[PDB]
């Protein structure tokens, strides 16, 4: 059966990805929290 | 269809009283003196 997450590099990097989070202030937030947390993969 | 209770060590060891391997049907080989299975060809020599 068709399950979820039919992977796609372009959409993955479009809906997510550094420049997309840097396009909205709320996007800028999640990077802020992820650095405060010391995350290694930020977007 | 599930065990209503534990099988104690006593019951366990009791059930497996008859669960054992038998010593092989081995006889001495007439050409080499090493043991072989009866009615089989000796694997050390290769006789009868």
């Amino acid at each position: 059966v068709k399950r979820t997450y039919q992977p796609n590099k372009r959409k993955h990097s479009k809906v997510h990805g550094f420049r997309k989070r840097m396009s909205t202030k709320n996007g800028r937030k999640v990077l802020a929290r992820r650095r405060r947390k010391g995350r290694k993969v930020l977007s | 269809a599930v065990p209503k209770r534990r099988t104690s060590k006593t019951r366990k060891n009791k059930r497996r009283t008859h669960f054992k391997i038998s010593v092989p049907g081995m006889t001495e080989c007439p050409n080499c003196g090493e043991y072989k299975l009866s009615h089989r060809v000796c694997k050390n020599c290769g006789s009868y």
Binding site: - | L37, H39, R40, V41, K43
Partner: protein, 120 residues
């Protein structure tokens, strides 16, 4: 008789193939049940060979596979020709037997009693 844990078409085929291979090699290694069941087939083929008339040749052609043996000096001849020219003579005077069986110990991968069925 035995079924050998196998269907009818797959057994018919296995028995005839095993008989052919025995005829090629004159002694092979296999499990007890299949030796016990190829014994009769190979013995009956040799009987078809002890007559050599064209009817028995044509009739024994049913079972044997078509194989080629390279003898010494690069001489070539098929299973039928072997049966009717090199094995009919050997057992012209013997009135049975034609095969022996030598039990061997169990194999490793299973507990199957391997045996060697050989043309006597």
């Amino acid at each position: 008789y035995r079924k050998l844990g196998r269907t009818s078409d797959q057994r018919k085929a296995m028995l005839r193939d095993l008989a052919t291979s025995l005829i090629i090699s004159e002694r092979i290694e296999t499990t007890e049940a299949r030796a016990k069941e190829v014994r009769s087939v190979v013995e009956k083929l040799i009987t078809l060979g002890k007559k050599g008339d064209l009817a028995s040749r044509r009739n024994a052609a049913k079972t044997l596979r078509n194989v080629e043996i390279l003898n010494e000096d690069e001489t070539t001849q098929t299973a039928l020709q072997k049966l009717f020219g090199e094995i009919a003579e050997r057992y012209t005077e013997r009135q049975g037997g034609y095969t022996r069986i030598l039990k061997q110990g169990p194999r490793r991968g299973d507990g199957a009693e391997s045996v060697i069925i050989e043309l006597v």
